[PDB]
Ligand binder design. Structure first.
Ligand SMILES: Nc1ncnc2c1ncn2[C@@H]1O[C@H](COP(=O)(O)OC(=O)c2cccc(-c3noc(-c4ccccc4F)n3)c2)[C@@H](O)[C@H]1O
Length: 431
């Protein structure tokens, strides 16, 4: 019964051709040509980095990786707290079809070993503070030939930085504005291997390309408007942080980052950077439902606060929205296996307690926990989704893949949900 399969509407903008790398390259090149355009700001150390710096360094890393010998048969790991440098190797690798496997930087050596044993990287990009953990893992994973330090300018403890690595491999006369990213089959070439013991979630470039349609959608994303600034405290190595941030770069936004939550810094950053949109997780919503300091700050530029990654009660949401003088909360629901959010609060059409509506290109249904049948409006069952951001599979684990995704393409979330007569979805429980 089609009437009971909720479908997203048409994208405000058609899906662009090209790989995720090509699409990011093209957008960032444009922003780079406007001096002073800010890509990232570190709220802790206060430093800004422009699109020109980001673009040039990401292109130089792409070419250097290529010259070192990396191609679509290789993976890299990026292991780092949120930082100005985090996205440099991500973008560089996307530019040349090298799969990127972000590794949780609070993993211990064991979860880290499990992660990198699944992703099997040739080169590991790591922050200074993760270097020891990586050296220890490398002792067991000899495929790791090269370790590069992300947040250093010079060599660091005998290891090259991104800067000296690039200088080691760039051809003479290399021109970052003549560079052309690689073109390949975006359905078959993996962009990201994200972690779910966790599994590896393989995401073709196609999925990021669909994300980039959503990100700039005036209803399901953020309208592109000059001088937009986001405050993001969510981890970049997780799908919530990874795919919001890539979308923000596509949009030319200023992404102000924190890698440690602090109440005063967070509020003062909202005020002082005139933030339009802030990204939190539900436990930080409970935090701000307790906060009394919010009204000591001028937050009149703030348009939205976004949440995802876990259940948010409608009353905690209403309390936070009210404290921040917002009409509502911008929720998103997704899994690592769906790349990004596939239910998102439509702009101007928020409903407290809802997780939003089906995004463009997707469909969602809820099925009876007994009859496996599709249910109608206001009926609770297991949420299933189908669409072009669904993972190609768990890495080297097709049994787990088959257990999650059935023959007709439906991903069975394991979450209990219902949808209402406006086609808003409510997550209500889990199996
Ligand atoms: N809104 C929600 N409400 C209730 N439960 C939720 C939920 N979101 C996730 N869950 C639970 O967590 C499990 C999945 O846990 P992973 O670690 O695998 O994955 C993520 O959490 C994830 C991955 C990618 C993107 C996002 C995301 N969240 O918000 C946004 C977002 C918001 C605004 C705008 C744009 C956005 F992308 N993106 C979250 C589910 O089975 C479900 O049980």
């Amino acid at each position: 019964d089609a009437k009971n399969i909720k479908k997203g509407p048409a994208p405000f903008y058609p899906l662009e051709d090209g790989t995720a790398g090509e699409q990011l390259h093209k957008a960032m090149k444009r922003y780079a040509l406007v001096p002073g355009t800010i890509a990232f700001t570190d709220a802790h150390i206060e430093v800004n980095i422009t699109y020109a710096e980001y673009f040039e360094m990401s292109v130089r890393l792409a070419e250097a990786m290529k010259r070192y010998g990396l191609n679509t048969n290789h993976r890299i790991v990026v292991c780092s707290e949120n930082s100005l440098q985090f996205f440099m190797p991500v973008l560089g690798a996307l530019f040349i079809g090298v799969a990127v496997a972000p590794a949780n930087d609070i993993y211990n050596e064991r979860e880290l070993l499990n992660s990198m044993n699944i992703s099997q990287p040739t080169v590991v990009f790591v922050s200074k503070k993760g270097l020891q953990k990586i050296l220890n893992v490398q002792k067991k994973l000899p495929i790791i030939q090269k370790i590069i330090i992300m947040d250093s300018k010079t060599d660091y403890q005998g290891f090259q930085s991104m800067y000296t690595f690039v200088t080691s491999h760039l051809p003479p006369g290399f021109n970052e504005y003549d560079f052309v990213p690689e073109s390949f089959d975006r359905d078959k070439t993996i962009a990201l291997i994200m972690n779910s013991l966790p599994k590896g979630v393989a995401l073709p470039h196609r999925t990021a390309c669909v994300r980039f349609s959503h990100a700039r959608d005036p209803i399901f994303g953020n309208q592109i408007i000059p001088d937009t600034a986001i405050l993001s405290v969510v981890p970049f190595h997780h799908g919530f942080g990874m795919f919001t941030t890539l979308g923000y770069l596509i949009c030319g936004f200023r992404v102000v980052l924190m890698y440690r939550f602090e109440e005063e810094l967070f509020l003062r950053s909202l005020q002082d950077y005139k933030i339009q949109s802030a990204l939190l997780v539900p436990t930080l919503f409970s935090f701000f439902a307790k906060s009394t300091l919010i009204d000591k700050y001028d937050l009149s530029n703030l348009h939205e606060i976004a949440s995802g990654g876990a259940p948010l009660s409608k009353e905690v949401g209403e309390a936070v929205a009210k404290r921040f003088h917002l009409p509502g909360i911008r929720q998103g629901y997704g899994l690592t296996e769906t790349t990004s959010a596939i239910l998102i609060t439509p702009e101007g059409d928020d409903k407290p307690g809802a997780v939003g509506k089906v995004v463009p290109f997707f469909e969602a249904k809820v099925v009876d926990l007994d009859t496996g049948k599709t249910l109608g409006v206001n009926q609770r069952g297991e949420l299933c989704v189908r669409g072009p951001m669904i993972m190609s599979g768990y890495v080297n684990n097709p049994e787990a893949t088959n257990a999650l995704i059935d023959k007709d393409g439906w991903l069975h979330s394991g979450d209990i949900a219902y949808w209402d007569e406006d086609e808003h979805f409510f997550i209500v429980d889990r199996l």
